[PDB]
Amino acid sequence: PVSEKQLAEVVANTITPLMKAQSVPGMAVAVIYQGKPHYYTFGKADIAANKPVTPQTLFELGSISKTFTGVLGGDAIARGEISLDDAVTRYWPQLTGKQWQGIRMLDLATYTAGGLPLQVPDEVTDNASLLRFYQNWQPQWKPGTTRLYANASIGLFGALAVKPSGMPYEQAMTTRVLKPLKLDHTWINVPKAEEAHYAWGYRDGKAVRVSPGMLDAQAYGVKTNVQDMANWVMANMAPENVADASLKQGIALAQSRYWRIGSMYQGLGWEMLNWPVEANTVVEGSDSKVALAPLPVAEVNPPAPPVKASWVHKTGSTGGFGSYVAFIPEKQIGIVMLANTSYPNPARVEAAYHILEAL
Protein backbone atom coordinates (compact mmCIF):
# COMPACT_ATOMS: atom_id res chain seq x y z
CA PRO A 1 0.00 0.00 0.00
CA VAL A 2 1.75 3.16 -1.28
CA SER A 3 2.80 5.37 1.63
CA GLU A 4 1.40 8.86 2.05
CA LYS A 5 4.96 10.20 2.03
CA GLN A 6 5.78 8.09 -1.03
CA LEU A 7 2.81 9.53 -2.91
CA ALA A 8 3.90 13.09 -2.03
CA GLU A 9 7.38 12.32 -3.39
CA VAL A 10 6.02 10.95 -6.69
CA VAL A 11 3.89 14.07 -7.13
CA ALA A 12 6.75 16.44 -6.27
CA ASN A 13 9.21 14.57 -8.54
CA THR A 14 6.79 14.77 -11.47
CA ILE A 15 5.25 18.20 -10.99
CA THR A 16 8.40 20.21 -10.17
CA PRO A 17 10.31 19.38 -13.36
CA LEU A 18 7.09 19.74 -15.33
CA MET A 19 6.62 23.30 -14.03
CA LYS A 20 10.25 24.13 -14.75
CA ALA A 21 10.17 22.73 -18.30
CA GLN A 22 6.82 24.26 -19.21
CA SER A 23 7.34 27.62 -17.46
CA VAL A 24 4.31 27.18 -15.21
CA PRO A 25 4.00 29.76 -12.39
CA GLY A 26 1.65 27.75 -10.16
CA MET A 27 -0.17 24.45 -9.90
CA ALA A 28 -2.64 22.78 -7.63
CA VAL A 29 -2.87 19.01 -7.73
CA ALA A 30 -5.24 16.56 -6.10
CA VAL A 31 -4.79 12.79 -6.09
CA ILE A 32 -7.75 10.62 -5.08
CA TYR A 33 -6.54 7.39 -3.49
CA GLN A 34 -8.23 5.06 -1.00
CA GLY A 35 -11.41 7.11 -0.64
CA LYS A 36 -10.05 10.63 -0.14
CA PRO A 37 -8.27 13.48 -1.87
CA HIS A 38 -4.67 14.44 -1.21
CA TYR A 39 -3.64 18.00 -2.06
CA TYR A 40 -0.29 19.36 -3.36
CA THR A 41 0.27 23.02 -4.18
CA PHE A 42 3.16 24.62 -6.00
CA GLY A 43 4.34 28.09 -6.88
CA LYS A 44 2.43 31.31 -7.41
CA ALA A 45 -1.15 32.18 -8.26
CA ASP A 46 -0.23 35.83 -8.94
CA ILE A 47 3.38 36.64 -9.75
CA ALA A 48 3.17 40.43 -9.34
CA ALA A 49 1.22 40.30 -6.09
CA ASN A 50 3.44 37.43 -4.94
CA LYS A 51 0.43 35.29 -3.93
CA PRO A 52 1.04 31.53 -3.38
CA VAL A 53 -1.16 28.81 -4.88
CA THR A 54 -3.31 27.32 -2.11
CA PRO A 55 -6.13 24.80 -2.02
CA GLN A 56 -8.53 27.77 -2.23
CA THR A 57 -6.91 29.30 -5.30
CA LEU A 58 -9.39 29.56 -8.18
CA PHE A 59 -8.29 28.37 -11.62
CA GLU A 60 -10.02 28.60 -15.01
CA LEU A 61 -11.12 25.10 -16.06
CA GLY A 62 -11.53 25.95 -19.73
CA SER A 63 -13.07 22.99 -21.54
CA ILE A 64 -13.33 20.87 -18.35
CA SER A 65 -16.43 22.96 -17.81
CA LYS A 66 -18.13 20.59 -20.27
CA THR A 67 -18.08 17.78 -17.69
CA PHE A 68 -20.50 19.86 -15.58
CA THR A 69 -22.59 20.48 -18.69
CA GLY A 70 -22.74 16.79 -19.43
CA VAL A 71 -23.77 15.87 -15.90
CA LEU A 72 -26.40 18.63 -15.77
CA GLY A 73 -27.83 17.34 -19.05
CA GLY A 74 -27.72 13.78 -17.68
CA ASP A 75 -29.63 14.97 -14.65
CA ALA A 76 -32.32 16.55 -16.85
CA ILE A 77 -32.65 13.23 -18.73
CA ALA A 78 -33.02 11.34 -15.43
CA ARG A 79 -35.73 13.81 -14.38
CA GLY A 80 -37.68 13.05 -17.57
CA GLU A 81 -37.35 16.62 -18.83
CA ILE A 82 -35.38 15.87 -21.97
CA SER A 83 -34.30 12.92 -24.06
CA LEU A 84 -31.02 12.62 -25.99
CA ASP A 85 -33.03 11.37 -28.99
CA ASP A 86 -35.26 14.47 -29.00
CA ALA A 87 -34.94 16.84 -31.94
CA VAL A 88 -33.03 20.08 -31.30
CA THR A 89 -36.09 21.93 -32.61
CA ARG A 90 -38.23 20.54 -29.76
CA TYR A 91 -36.36 22.93 -27.47
CA TRP A 92 -35.77 25.74 -29.99
CA PRO A 93 -38.78 25.95 -32.28
CA GLN A 94 -37.49 29.23 -33.77
CA LEU A 95 -34.67 27.19 -35.31
CA THR A 96 -36.70 26.60 -38.47
CA GLY A 97 -33.84 25.91 -40.93
CA LYS A 98 -34.40 22.57 -42.59
CA GLN A 99 -30.79 21.48 -42.12
CA TRP A 100 -31.73 20.96 -38.44
CA GLN A 101 -34.26 18.27 -39.24
CA GLY A 102 -32.94 14.94 -38.03
CA ILE A 103 -30.34 16.47 -35.70
CA ARG A 104 -30.78 15.32 -32.11
CA MET A 105 -29.87 16.65 -28.71
CA LEU A 106 -27.39 13.78 -28.63
CA ASP A 107 -25.56 15.21 -31.65
CA LEU A 108 -25.21 18.61 -29.99
CA ALA A 109 -23.94 17.05 -26.75
CA THR A 110 -21.35 14.81 -28.42
CA TYR A 111 -20.18 16.96 -31.36
CA THR A 112 -21.82 14.87 -34.11
CA ALA A 113 -24.27 17.41 -35.55
CA GLY A 114 -22.28 17.49 -38.81
CA GLY A 115 -19.52 20.10 -38.59
CA LEU A 116 -20.62 22.83 -36.14
CA PRO A 117 -17.41 24.86 -35.76
CA LEU A 118 -15.13 24.95 -32.74
CA GLN A 119 -16.15 28.45 -31.67
CA VAL A 120 -19.24 30.56 -31.48
CA PRO A 121 -18.16 33.54 -33.58
CA ASP A 122 -17.26 36.71 -31.74
CA GLU A 123 -20.03 38.71 -33.44
CA VAL A 124 -22.55 36.55 -31.63
CA THR A 125 -23.48 38.65 -28.62
CA ASP A 126 -27.19 38.07 -28.14
CA ASN A 127 -30.06 35.73 -28.81
CA ALA A 128 -30.85 37.23 -32.23
CA SER A 129 -27.26 36.75 -33.49
CA LEU A 130 -27.02 33.29 -31.89
CA LEU A 131 -30.20 32.36 -33.78
CA ARG A 132 -28.78 33.76 -37.04
CA PHE A 133 -25.53 31.83 -36.56
CA TYR A 134 -27.27 28.46 -36.20
CA GLN A 135 -29.84 29.30 -38.89
CA ASN A 136 -27.08 30.06 -41.38
CA TRP A 137 -24.87 27.11 -40.53
CA GLN A 138 -24.53 24.59 -43.36
CA PRO A 139 -23.46 21.11 -42.20
CA GLN A 140 -20.48 19.58 -44.01
CA TRP A 141 -21.65 16.10 -42.95
CA LYS A 142 -24.81 14.20 -42.16
CA PRO A 143 -25.64 13.92 -38.45
CA GLY A 144 -24.00 11.12 -36.51
CA THR A 145 -21.19 10.44 -38.97
CA THR A 146 -18.40 12.82 -37.97
CA ARG A 147 -17.08 14.08 -34.60
CA LEU A 148 -15.76 17.61 -34.61
CA TYR A 149 -15.05 18.89 -31.10
CA ALA A 150 -17.06 22.09 -30.79
CA ASN A 151 -17.98 24.62 -28.10
CA ALA A 152 -20.80 25.74 -30.43
CA SER A 153 -22.20 22.19 -30.28
CA ILE A 154 -22.17 21.23 -26.55
CA GLY A 155 -22.73 24.92 -25.65
CA LEU A 156 -26.06 24.82 -27.41
CA PHE A 157 -26.88 21.42 -25.92
CA GLY A 158 -26.37 22.91 -22.46
CA ALA A 159 -28.53 25.99 -23.06
CA LEU A 160 -31.37 23.87 -24.47
CA ALA A 161 -31.19 21.10 -21.86
CA VAL A 162 -32.27 23.42 -19.07
CA LYS A 163 -35.24 24.96 -20.92
CA PRO A 164 -37.91 22.62 -19.57
CA SER A 165 -36.73 23.30 -15.99
CA GLY A 166 -37.62 26.98 -16.47
CA MET A 167 -34.35 27.95 -14.78
CA PRO A 168 -31.50 29.86 -16.34
CA TYR A 169 -28.43 27.72 -16.94
CA GLU A 170 -26.30 29.04 -14.06
CA GLN A 171 -29.12 28.58 -11.57
CA ALA A 172 -29.96 25.06 -12.82
CA MET A 173 -26.33 24.07 -12.37
CA THR A 174 -26.12 25.49 -8.85
CA THR A 175 -29.41 23.99 -7.60
CA ARG A 176 -29.13 20.62 -9.33
CA VAL A 177 -25.36 19.84 -9.38
CA LEU A 178 -23.14 22.17 -7.30
CA LYS A 179 -25.20 22.51 -4.10
CA PRO A 180 -26.04 18.84 -3.76
CA LEU A 181 -22.36 18.00 -4.14
CA LYS A 182 -21.31 20.84 -1.81
CA LEU A 183 -19.24 22.47 -4.52
CA ASP A 184 -19.64 25.86 -2.95
CA HIS A 185 -16.54 27.52 -4.43
CA THR A 186 -17.24 26.71 -8.07
CA TRP A 187 -18.20 29.74 -10.10
CA ILE A 188 -19.20 30.95 -13.49
CA ASN A 189 -19.09 34.48 -12.05
CA VAL A 190 -16.57 35.03 -9.21
CA PRO A 191 -18.26 36.87 -6.36
CA LYS A 192 -16.60 40.00 -4.95
CA ALA A 193 -15.83 38.25 -1.71
CA GLU A 194 -13.98 35.41 -3.49
CA GLU A 195 -11.87 37.53 -5.84
CA ALA A 196 -8.79 37.36 -3.62
CA HIS A 197 -8.58 33.65 -4.40
CA TYR A 198 -8.75 34.04 -8.21
CA ALA A 199 -5.37 33.24 -9.79
CA TRP A 200 -4.05 35.13 -12.78
CA GLY A 201 -3.32 33.14 -15.90
CA TYR A 202 0.00 33.57 -17.66
CA ARG A 203 0.98 33.60 -21.32
CA ASP A 204 4.46 34.56 -22.57
CA GLY A 205 4.81 36.48 -19.33
CA LYS A 206 1.54 38.49 -19.55
CA ALA A 207 -1.15 38.05 -16.87
CA VAL A 208 -4.49 37.22 -18.49
CA ARG A 209 -7.90 35.98 -17.50
CA VAL A 210 -10.74 34.64 -19.63
CA SER A 211 -13.19 37.08 -21.24
CA PRO A 212 -16.99 36.70 -21.53
CA GLY A 213 -18.34 34.88 -24.56
CA MET A 214 -21.63 33.46 -25.78
CA LEU A 215 -22.35 30.06 -24.23
CA ASP A 216 -19.16 30.36 -22.16
CA ALA A 217 -20.69 28.82 -19.00
CA GLN A 218 -21.60 25.65 -20.92
CA ALA A 219 -18.28 25.26 -22.73
CA TYR A 220 -15.30 26.88 -21.07
CA GLY A 221 -16.15 29.41 -18.37
CA VAL A 222 -16.10 27.64 -15.02
CA LYS A 223 -13.64 28.64 -12.29
CA THR A 224 -12.94 26.45 -9.27
CA ASN A 225 -10.39 25.43 -6.66
CA VAL A 226 -8.58 22.13 -6.28
CA GLN A 227 -10.84 21.03 -3.43
CA ASP A 228 -14.10 21.38 -5.29
CA MET A 229 -12.47 19.77 -8.31
CA ALA A 230 -11.22 16.80 -6.27
CA ASN A 231 -14.74 16.34 -4.88
CA TRP A 232 -16.24 16.69 -8.36
CA VAL A 233 -13.98 13.87 -9.49
CA MET A 234 -14.91 11.75 -6.49
CA ALA A 235 -18.63 12.11 -7.25
CA ASN A 236 -18.00 11.14 -10.90
CA MET A 237 -15.68 8.28 -9.87
CA ALA A 238 -18.07 6.88 -7.24
CA PRO A 239 -21.65 7.98 -8.04
CA GLU A 240 -22.96 5.26 -5.72
CA ASN A 241 -22.18 7.70 -2.90
CA VAL A 242 -24.31 10.47 -4.40
CA ALA A 243 -27.64 10.67 -2.61
CA ASP A 244 -29.86 12.49 -5.10
CA ALA A 245 -31.29 9.86 -7.42
CA SER A 246 -31.49 11.95 -10.62
CA LEU A 247 -28.01 13.33 -10.10
CA LYS A 248 -26.63 9.83 -9.49
CA GLN A 249 -28.19 8.74 -12.79
CA GLY A 250 -27.02 11.90 -14.54
CA ILE A 251 -23.43 11.14 -13.61
CA ALA A 252 -23.83 7.65 -15.12
CA LEU A 253 -25.34 9.12 -18.31
CA ALA A 254 -22.37 11.48 -18.78
CA GLN A 255 -19.92 8.54 -18.65
CA SER A 256 -22.01 6.36 -20.89
CA ARG A 257 -20.50 5.62 -24.30
CA TYR A 258 -22.43 7.10 -27.24
CA TRP A 259 -19.82 6.91 -29.97
CA ARG A 260 -16.53 5.18 -30.68
CA ILE A 261 -13.81 7.28 -32.32
CA GLY A 262 -10.81 5.02 -32.83
CA SER A 263 -9.62 4.04 -29.36
CA MET A 264 -11.63 6.72 -27.52
CA TYR A 265 -15.32 6.86 -26.60
CA GLN A 266 -17.43 9.99 -26.31
CA GLY A 267 -19.63 10.58 -23.28
CA LEU A 268 -21.41 13.74 -22.22
CA GLY A 269 -18.43 16.09 -21.79
CA TRP A 270 -16.33 13.25 -20.40
CA GLU A 271 -14.21 11.17 -22.74
CA MET A 272 -13.26 7.57 -22.06
CA LEU A 273 -10.79 4.89 -23.13
CA ASN A 274 -10.97 1.23 -21.99
CA TRP A 275 -8.64 0.40 -19.07
CA PRO A 276 -5.99 -0.85 -19.24
CA VAL A 277 -4.61 1.78 -21.61
CA GLU A 278 -0.97 2.54 -22.39
CA ALA A 279 0.39 6.05 -21.89
CA ASN A 280 1.22 6.54 -25.59
CA THR A 281 -2.39 5.89 -26.63
CA VAL A 282 -3.79 8.60 -24.34
CA VAL A 283 -0.93 11.01 -24.94
CA GLU A 284 -1.04 10.97 -28.71
CA GLY A 285 -4.83 11.22 -28.58
CA SER A 286 -4.46 14.48 -26.68
CA ASP A 287 -2.44 16.19 -29.39
CA SER A 288 -4.25 19.17 -30.96
CA LYS A 289 -3.86 17.62 -34.40
CA VAL A 290 -5.99 14.66 -33.31
CA ALA A 291 -8.19 16.43 -30.75
CA LEU A 292 -9.42 19.12 -33.16
CA ALA A 293 -9.81 16.90 -36.26
CA PRO A 294 -13.05 15.81 -37.87
CA LEU A 295 -13.05 12.05 -37.43
CA PRO A 296 -15.59 9.36 -38.28
CA VAL A 297 -17.80 7.92 -35.56
CA ALA A 298 -19.24 4.50 -34.89
CA GLU A 299 -22.56 4.68 -33.04
CA VAL A 300 -22.99 2.84 -29.74
CA ASN A 301 -26.69 1.98 -29.80
CA PRO A 302 -28.06 1.54 -27.31
CA PRO A 303 -25.51 3.70 -25.50
CA ALA A 304 -23.32 1.59 -23.23
CA PRO A 305 -23.74 2.36 -19.54
CA PRO A 306 -20.61 3.35 -17.60
CA VAL A 307 -17.70 0.92 -17.83
CA LYS A 308 -15.83 0.92 -14.53
CA ALA A 309 -12.66 -0.21 -16.28
CA SER A 310 -12.28 3.12 -18.08
CA TRP A 311 -9.70 5.87 -18.16
CA VAL A 312 -12.16 8.76 -17.88
CA HIS A 313 -10.68 12.19 -18.61
CA LYS A 314 -10.94 15.74 -19.93
CA THR A 315 -8.43 18.41 -20.99
CA GLY A 316 -9.23 22.12 -20.59
CA SER A 317 -7.43 25.38 -21.36
CA THR A 318 -8.04 29.06 -21.61
CA GLY A 319 -5.59 31.73 -22.73
CA GLY A 320 -3.74 31.64 -19.42
CA PHE A 321 -4.67 28.30 -17.76
CA GLY A 322 -4.05 24.65 -18.44
CA SER A 323 -5.83 21.84 -16.64
CA TYR A 324 -6.40 18.11 -16.77
CA VAL A 325 -8.51 15.55 -14.94
CA ALA A 326 -8.46 11.76 -15.18
CA PHE A 327 -9.83 8.88 -13.11
CA ILE A 328 -10.28 5.14 -13.21
CA PRO A 329 -13.48 3.99 -11.50
CA GLU A 330 -12.41 0.34 -11.35
CA LYS A 331 -9.33 1.25 -9.30
CA GLN A 332 -10.90 4.17 -7.36
CA ILE A 333 -7.99 6.48 -8.19
CA GLY A 334 -7.97 9.85 -9.89
CA ILE A 335 -6.03 13.04 -10.40
CA VAL A 336 -6.68 16.77 -10.84
CA MET A 337 -3.97 19.08 -12.25
CA LEU A 338 -4.78 22.82 -12.33
CA ALA A 339 -2.19 25.22 -13.74
CA ASN A 340 -2.02 28.94 -14.55
CA THR A 341 -0.39 28.47 -17.90
CA SER A 342 -1.58 26.63 -20.97
CA TYR A 343 1.11 24.06 -21.69
CA PRO A 344 0.86 21.21 -24.16
CA ASN A 345 -1.80 18.58 -23.55
CA PRO A 346 0.58 15.66 -24.11
CA ALA A 347 2.68 16.89 -21.20
CA ARG A 348 -0.40 17.02 -18.94
CA VAL A 349 -1.35 13.46 -19.83
CA GLU A 350 2.18 12.05 -19.44
CA ALA A 351 2.53 13.57 -15.97
CA ALA A 352 -0.94 12.46 -14.86
CA TYR A 353 -0.42 8.90 -16.13
CA HIS A 354 2.97 8.57 -14.40
CA ILE A 355 1.51 9.69 -11.08
CA LEU A 356 -1.48 7.36 -11.29
CA GLU A 357 0.85 4.52 -12.36
CA ALA A 358 2.46 4.80 -8.94
CA LEU A 359 -0.87 3.77 -7.33
Ligand SMILES: *C(=O)[C@H]([C@H](O)CCc1cccs1)[C@@H]1N[C@@H](C(=O)O)C(C)(C)S1
Ligand atom coordinates in the same frame (compact mmCIF):
# COMPACT_ATOMS: atom_id res chain seq x y z
C1 LIG B 1 -11.16 23.82 -24.18
O1 LIG B 1 -10.25 23.84 -23.36
C2 LIG B 1 -10.98 24.30 -25.58
C3 LIG B 1 -11.98 25.41 -25.88
O2 LIG B 1 -11.83 25.71 -27.27
C4 LIG B 1 -11.73 26.66 -25.05
C5 LIG B 1 -12.66 27.77 -25.53
C6 LIG B 1 -12.30 29.14 -25.00
C7 LIG B 1 -12.78 30.43 -25.28
C8 LIG B 1 -12.13 31.43 -24.52
C9 LIG B 1 -11.16 30.93 -23.65
S1 LIG B 1 -11.03 29.24 -23.83
C10 LIG B 1 -11.26 23.11 -26.46
N1 LIG B 1 -10.88 21.92 -25.64
C11 LIG B 1 -9.46 21.64 -25.90
C12 LIG B 1 -9.10 20.31 -25.30
O3 LIG B 1 -7.93 20.13 -24.90
O4 LIG B 1 -10.00 19.44 -25.21
C13 LIG B 1 -9.24 21.72 -27.41
C14 LIG B 1 -7.78 21.97 -27.77
C15 LIG B 1 -9.76 20.45 -28.06
S2 LIG B 1 -10.25 23.08 -27.91
